């Protein structure tokens, strides 16, 4: 078990034997572009590295096998990364998003630990045996901060230093080592930022840093070298290898570097998701992003109410809490030209339209269970009947309101007609109605019809691309891009009141979150909201978000109130379409290619 050095340079993570020389070759990796930060798990014999050109964090065994991209979403510049080898967690710092995030070595249960008051955090060093994490911030007045490995107890450890890199922990002597890139020095301190000593003051430009036994190894971008020296006096310097320009990270791969123990290593602290280390040598259970910790301090609960705004290449989730949690990009693959989204709160599964692939797809929030429900046919918008478990959606090609089941089997075409172009759709199954836009040439309109295409009337005629609906407020909302404004009305058609119409360029989406009206401006790249109770007024939620496509609010499904709808219990006995009448009973109906039968429930052909 011979100790050796490992360093990243361009697209090569390479190995340099310390004692004598052997295996001075690169680690056989396939798709590396710009390797940066490095760490390892010595018992699993695996290496972990980041990539800026790819915006990824990958892991692979020492022989290049089992190369997998652990983190591949929501990364901008992961210049720092470290491995919790006891709790088996992966920490990293991003200077583009300015946040320190944690997950597992597998990659699941990604959580943001620090996100406030961060100014470009880069170097990262962990100490799970004591429950502390240390990092360096390169922003205005750079500094070195310490926090508990769950994000709490964050203080400033070194305030006077310059831009620090190569933060390395000597666990035996209990000391910190780092390099000052502005004064071009190598310094050390104790675990509290005190007893500060200057290890080396005459080096050209030390950059990366690591420590092993009584020796300190550093890189030099001026001399383009890897050197080592006595960690105490700073002398007995030898050049390990030269002609190495722009070596990003460097470290010693040896078991003695990863010792210690906490409860997370023994039993994962009996936590459901994350086990994070805290002082002193203790632990607390952590949850995925947007998840909350239950009363047992062990299990995590997914968020029940939230927002979902999707752009051309991503689908994101917003959460409103007092701590102002950051938005999360849902790790769903094969997202090309997204145009609409919806969500089923019963099975808790997300649905969306993909225009490029030209299909409607569903998947869980973590990305699992990818299922294609319909696949020429150009779907435009969609809306879910969560009671009949149906999806109503318009087609841009056939110009038709078509309805399909969640399992993919079509119930049939509900609306069709010449000189008709139905685009946006929203369903109100509590009242058995559906509202949609009809963009006829030189004649737009907003129409309502029953969930079977009958009782088709015209609601809004003159003065005019997305509809929102709220039954609690009894209000219908829409937004026009030509006139560039947003309007509201009642479900019956009365009180057509114009909302805030100024400072709007190109509205695309609308939803109702509690007593608020969220809408997205695509060209202005904004997510805003209007207070529905008329108290706080117009407010900007987020600015400069490109390629926006849709937004969808999600309230928690009260299953007690859900089971009360007669359309939900075996579809009210109706094959196909169940309709709710004024009195509250049900009445069956069917698409245009079928006809109701004697039992007033089933349907079929005719002759």
């Amino acid at each position, epitope marked *: 078990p011979e100790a050796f050095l490992l360093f990243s340079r*361009r697209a090569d993570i390479r190995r340099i034997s310390l004692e004598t020389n052997n295996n001075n070759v690169a680690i056989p990796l396939t798709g590396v572009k*710009e390797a*940066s930060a490095l760490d390892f798990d010595v018992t699993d014999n695996r290496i972990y590295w980041t990539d*800026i*050109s790819l915006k990824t964090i990958s892991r692979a065994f020492m022989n290049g096998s089992a190369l997998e991209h652990v983190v591949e979403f929501g990364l901008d*510049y992961p*210049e720092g990364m470290a491995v919790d080898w006891l709790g088996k967690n992966l920490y990293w710092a991003d*200077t583009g998003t300015n946040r320190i995030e944690v997950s597992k070595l597998d990659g699941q249960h990604r959580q943001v630990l620090v996100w406030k008051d961060l*100014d*470009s955090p880069r170097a990262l060093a962990l100490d799970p045996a004591e429950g502390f994490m240390y990092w360096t911030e*390169w*922003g205005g007045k750079p500094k070195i901060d310490r926090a508990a490995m769950d994000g709490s107890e964050r203080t400033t450890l070194v305030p006077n230093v*310059g*831009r620090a*890199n190569g933060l390395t922990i000597d666990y035996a002597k209990r000391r910190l080592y780092w390099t000052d*890139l*502005d*004064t*071009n020095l190598i310094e050390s301190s104790n675990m509290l930022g005190l007893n500060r000593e200057v290890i080396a003051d005459d080096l*050209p*430009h030390p*950059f990366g840093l690591t420590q092993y036994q009584d020796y300190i190894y550093w890189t030099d*971008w*001026s001399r383009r070298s890897i050197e080592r020296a006595n960690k105490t006096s700073g002398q007995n310097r030898t050049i390990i290898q030269g002609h190495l*320009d*722009y070596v*990003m990270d460097i470290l010693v791969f040896h078991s003695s570097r990863q010792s210690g123990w906490n409860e997370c290593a023994s039993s994962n602290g009996h936590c459901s998701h994350l086990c994070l280390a805290v002082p002193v040598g203790g632990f607390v259970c952590g949850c995925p992003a947007h998840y909350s910790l239950n009363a047992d301090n062990r299990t995590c609960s997914a968020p029940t109410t939230f927002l979902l705004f999707s752009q051309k290449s991503a689908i994101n989730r917003m959460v409103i809490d007092e701590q102002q949690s950051p938005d999360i990009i849902l790790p769903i693959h094969s997202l090309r030209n997204v145009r609409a989204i919806d969500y089923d709160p019963l099975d808790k599964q997300l649905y969306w339209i993909d225009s490029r692939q030209n299909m409607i797809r569903k998947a869980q929030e973590d990305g699992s269970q990818g299922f294609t429900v319909v696949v020429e046919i150009q779907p435009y918008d969609l809306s879910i009947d969560i009671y009949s478990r149906y999806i109503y959606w318009t087609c841009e090609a056939t110009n038709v309101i078509n309805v399909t089941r969640l399992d993919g089997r079509s119930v049939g075409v509900v609306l069709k007609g010449e000189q008709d172009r139905p685009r946006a759709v929203v369903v109100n199954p509590e009242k058995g109605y559906m509202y949609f836009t009809n963009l006829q040439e030189r004649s737009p309109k907003i129409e309502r019809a029953a969930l079977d295409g009958t009782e088709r009337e015209v609601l809004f005629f003159s003065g005019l691309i997305a509809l929102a609906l709220d039954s609690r407020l009894g209000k219908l909302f829409w937004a026009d891009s030509d006139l560039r404004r947003i309007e509201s009305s009642d479900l019956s058609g009365a009180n057509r009141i114009v909302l805030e119409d100024s400072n709007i360029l190109q509205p695309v989406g609308l939803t109702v979150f509690e007593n608020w009206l969220y809408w997205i401006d695509k060209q202005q790249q904004m997510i805003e909201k209007i207070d529905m109770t008329g108290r706080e007024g117009r407010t900007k939620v987020q600015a400069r978000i490109a390629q926006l496509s849709d937004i969808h609010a999600v309230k928690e499904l009260n299953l007690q109130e859900y089971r009360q709808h007669p359309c939900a219990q075996d579809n009210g006995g109706c094959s196909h379409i169940c309709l709710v009448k004024g009195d509250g009973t049900t009445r069956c109906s069917c698409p245009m290619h079928l006809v109701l039968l004697q039992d007033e429930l089933s349907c079929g052909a005719a002759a």
Partner: nanobody, 119 residues
């Protein structure tokens, strides 16, 4: 990513002086060094001088050593090249170049400024 904007420079008599400026915008916290290059109408790119982003280290080529003085502003994100004892051999287009700790060798370039020395 970093964007550089060169400014200053023009028609200057022989034996005079002229101060060049280079404004860095973007991820300037990640800047390692800033180097000045120049392109003559005949010769190709020539390396002139470099300075670390903290101003602690500096390097001048022997072609301009003793005359030119590369520096960084005391606050702003700009670097200056003070050119003294100008010769007709210095007539060229001067380029600012940034090398960052992130992305490493990837050089972010500016558009450069034209400098002419008449005699």
């Amino acid at each position: 990513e970093v964007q550089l904007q060169e400014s200053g420079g023009g028609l200057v008599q022989a034996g005079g002086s002229l101060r060049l400026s280079c404004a860095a915008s973007g991820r300037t916290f990640s800047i390692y060094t800033i180097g000045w290059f120049r392109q003559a109408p005949g010769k190709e790119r020539e390396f002139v001088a470099e300075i670390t982003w903290s101003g602690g280290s500096t390097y001048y080529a022997d072609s301009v050593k003793g005359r030119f003085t590369i520096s960084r502003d005391n606050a702003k994100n700009t670097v200056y090249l003070q050119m003294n004892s100008l010769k007709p051999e210095d007539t060229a287009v001067y380029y600012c170049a940034a090398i960052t700790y992130t992305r490493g060798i990837y050089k972010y370039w500016g558009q450069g400024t034209q400098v002419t020395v008449s005699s």
